[PDB]
Amino acid sequence: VELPSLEDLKVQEVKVSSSVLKAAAHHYGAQCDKPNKEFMLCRWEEKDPRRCLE
């Protein structure tokens, strides 16, 4: 197998806790809806999460 580099990692990581992530959490998902629902098709409809990194 072949893997992507150490680059295309180390992105700006959301460093929050569990409750403050679950704090808003409800207003969150129901109003972005372009990158995330399409990301599910990038994971369900085609597998191998090594292709799907954008």
């Binding site: 679950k22 409800h26 969150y28 998902g29 599910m40």
Partner: protein, 67 residues
Amino acid sequence: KQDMPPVGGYGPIDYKRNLPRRGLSGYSMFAVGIGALLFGYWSMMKWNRERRRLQIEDFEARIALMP
């Protein structure tokens, strides 16, 4: 001439036998029982049904995250 029995002052006490106090019987009971029990299940379906609504909200916060 100093002997016992009095000229008067007596009872007597009874030989009888009685304490039949009723008692709320005979279709009065089996009516307070069912009337209490149906108040219980009526106090259900307002809590168990309502907890089922907050249950879905608890799963809701899970699903709006995890992409």
